[PDB]
Amino acid sequence: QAPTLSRVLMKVDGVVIQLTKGSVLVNGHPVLLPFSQSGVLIQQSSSYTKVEARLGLVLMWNHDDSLLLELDTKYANKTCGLCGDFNGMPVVSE
Amino acid sequence: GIYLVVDTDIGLVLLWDKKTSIFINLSPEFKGRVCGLCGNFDDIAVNDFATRSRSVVGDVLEFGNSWKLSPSCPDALAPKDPCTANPFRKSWAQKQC
Ligand SMILES: [Ca+2]
16 A cells, blocks of 8 residues: 555566566576566566567556456366456356 | 386395386394394384494484495585575476376
8 A cells, every 4th residue: 555566476487587576587586677487477568568478368457557368278177266266157166 | 117126035025127126125024133234123113223233313414324234434414405506497406206
């Protein structure tokens, strides 16, 4: 607290990415964008920070404080969290 | 199968996968009669660390090193943590296992 986003923690196939306002850490080490490692690409644009994982995920942290996640369809019915169980039915199983 | 079975008439059976794995089956006629790195076969697992000098020790390294055939062979030391010395493999290992 404005409902700001302070930290985003990602574990992608053994790669740890910490995104904070003005800082990107990979495995505990600050990095310079664009940064490609172990099939994970982190790049900053004029309006967003994008983390693309070749296993099939895209994360967008925009500058209006919006976090958007797009997943490959192979992860359907296999997820949990605030984003639901990803089975195409809104209420059931969440 | 993938196994090579050596069968003996004394009650001892060996299964070897042509690799580092080996399984030794002993008949109940040898309880309390055997020794070595495989224990002494007396239903008690805490005294299986008996050394060649016939003393149960708490150090695995000492108990193992007491059973080397050649006294002139160097003693084995404590190895490093495999996933700490090689962290770049660790994830794969977990994902594999
Ligand atoms: Ca024993």
